[PDB]
Amino acid sequence: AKSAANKLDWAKVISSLRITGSTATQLSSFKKRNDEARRQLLELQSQPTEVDFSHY
């Protein structure tokens, strides 16, 4: 359900067309892009965080 957040962010991108010279607002969206792109590879990267006592 993150697409509503990002859809309203691109809505504010085509509305931040109206204010040229954005200092750090797009950089704040860059920081949420940074850790949101980090968290998905973090959750997909891991194994089930346990020692496999049956086989291993």
């Binding site: 109206r18 204010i19 040229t20 010279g21 954005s22 200092t23």
Partner: protein, 89 residues
């Protein structure tokens, strides 16, 4: 086949004093018990890192904080610099 039989009996029994009864070894001049189960037993923690990686360091994360509960003397600066951006906008 007594060829096979005597071969396998010497095959079983000639290291059986190295495996069954621990009268360590007659032909090998260095001793065998301080090779693998005494020296090389701590081998993998002599081959990997000791007391951080093998003890594995169940470690507490550094609790990173918020903007330290100070709105005023920086929200007014953000507001006036935003006035300056909208001047430049």
């Amino acid at each position: 086949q007594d060829l096979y039989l005597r071969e396998l009996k010497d095959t079983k029994l000639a290291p059986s004093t190295l495996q069954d009864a621990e009268g360590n070894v007659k032909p090998w001049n260095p001793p065998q018990k301080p090779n693998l189960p005494e020296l090389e037993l701590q081998g993998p923690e002599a081959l990997k890192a000791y007391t951080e990686q093998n003890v594995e360091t169940a470690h507490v994360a550094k609790e990173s904080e918020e903007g330290e509960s100070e709105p005023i003397e920086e929200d007014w600066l953000v507001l006036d610099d935003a006035e300056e951006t909208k001047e430049s906008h």
